[model samples]
Target chain A: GGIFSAEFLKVFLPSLLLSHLLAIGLGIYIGRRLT
Target chain B: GGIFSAEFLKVFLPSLLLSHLLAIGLGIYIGRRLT
Candidate 1:
């Protein structure tokens, strides 16, 4: 479990957060632009 | 046998997700804002 997750983690969480933060930041920027 | 987890986050399932979130957040924060 540990080894598999550790490696899969290299792909999984980084993407989730990267997309999320990017989405939120871009959303805020666009939202503000529209306001 | 052991059905229940020992951790505090009983609301979520047994997950690598939390660790993933931590790593991604760290990566993002560190990637651009290295002081």
Candidate 2:
């Protein structure tokens, strides 16, 4: 449990955060551009 | 930014949390069952 959680936090968290941040940023940019 | 943030919190946060919780739960379950 500890190992899995540690590895997951180290790997998955950053990737997910970056992907989601990019998605939200792009969406906002495009939305404003279209409006 | 506000709308983007709100949407992200509402959607992505829950999904990410749920995934992490599931992973943790599965890991513990497997560890217990296999050991």
Candidate 3:
């Protein structure tokens, strides 16, 4: 997002940040081992 | 934007490279086990 330009980021930053956080959290949860 | 530039593709190369690959194809190596 940030690398896509301010215009792109301006329009996409919110979703990008949201998805970025989601990705990390998903990594945390999705990558978790269940036993 | 990389410090506010689309050229940030070059500017944020390292983080972009790392994050890009991680966010994408995350299942390529792990999506083969379901049986």
Candidate 4:
């Protein structure tokens, strides 16, 4: 399952991180704005 | 490809959104805190 899992991870980690960056980015931006 | 893609989607969307929610939640929290 190495190849399969690796392929899955190839998409998973990056995709996950990108979404995270987007969400937190806006959160921080708004939080600072509100303050 | 229904089952294969669906399996991937099952993990992908939920996983993606969870990270997003966590990141943004903290971002807004810190932003307001700084303000």
Candidate 5:
């Protein structure tokens, strides 16, 4: 295919969720520090 | 290259860090909810 392909996205999406999970954790951390 | 390669990792490491950053946000969110 091209530089980016369907398979690339197969992995990229799960990878994105994994990243979002961490973002949630960070929000919590700052929340505590602020409180 | 086999299913994976050095170039794959080049993309993977930064990708991993991006994931971790998400968690940091997660942490802050929890912190506030608890506090």
Candidate 6:
């Protein structure tokens, strides 16, 4: 369980972080344009 | 228009970046814990 948890984090972290970066950047861009 | 756009970026970028950092950090931590 511990090892699985660590491996899962290792696999998921970068993609998750990247998605957040894209989503937030685009979100603010859209927010500014629309408002 | 250019100045206002830059100002908007300046005002929102930091908060958006900070929130992304916090969210990513927390997500990895939680993903690790809960596998």
Which candidate ranks first by lDDT, i.e. highest? 4
Q: Judged by lDDT relative to the true structure, which candidate is superior, 3 or 4? A: 4
Q: List model 6 lDDT by residue over B1-35, tens digit each.
A: 46588788688759756777665565555444443
Candidate 5 lDDT tens digits, A1-35: 46767789789879777767766766775788788
| Cα TM-score per model | 0.35, 0.37, 0.40, 0.55, 0.44, 0.34
Ranking by TM-score: 4, 5, 3, 2, 1, 6
lDDT of 4 by residue, B1-35 (tens): 35679778879778766777788889989988873
Q: Under CAPRI classification, how is model 2 graded?
A: incorrect
User: Would you list the rank order by lDDT, best first?
Assistant: 4, 5, 6, 2, 1, 3
Q: List runs of model 6 lying over 4 Å from the truth.
A: A1-18, A21-35
Regions of candidate 5 where Cα sits further than 4 Å from its true position? A3-7, B1-30
Model 3's interface RMSD: 6.1
Model 3 bad stretches (over 4 Å): A1-10, B1-7, B20-35
Quickly count the clashes in candidate 2.
0
State the lDDT of candidate 5 residue by residue for B1-35, as single tens digits.
Answer: 33777779779879767767767766766676783
Q: Which lDDT tens digits does candidate 4 get at residues A1-35? A: 36588788788778666776788899999889878
TM-score of 3: 0.40
Backbone clashes in model 4, listed as residue pairs? A31-B31, A35-B35
User: Where does model 4 exceed 4 Å of error?
Assistant: A1-13, B1-12
Give DockQ per model, in order: 0.08, 0.03, 0.10, 0.62, 0.42, 0.04
Residue B16 alpha-carbon offset, candidate 4, angstroms:
2.2
By summed lDDT, which 10 consecutive residues of candidate 3 chain B come out lowest? B26-35
Query: What overall lDDT, based on C-alpha atoms, would model 4 receive against the true structure?
Result: 0.79
* Each candidate structure's count of clashing pairs: 0, 0, 1, 2, 30, 0
Candidate lDDT (C-alpha), each: 0.54, 0.59, 0.52, 0.79, 0.73, 0.62
Tell me the TM-score of chain B in each candidate. 0.44, 0.57, 0.33, 0.48, 0.53, 0.51
| Candidate 1 off by > 4 Å | A1-8, B1-35
For every model in order, the TM-score on chain A comes to 0.52, 0.53, 0.48, 0.50, 0.60, 0.50
Better candidate number, 1 or 6, judged by DockQ? 1
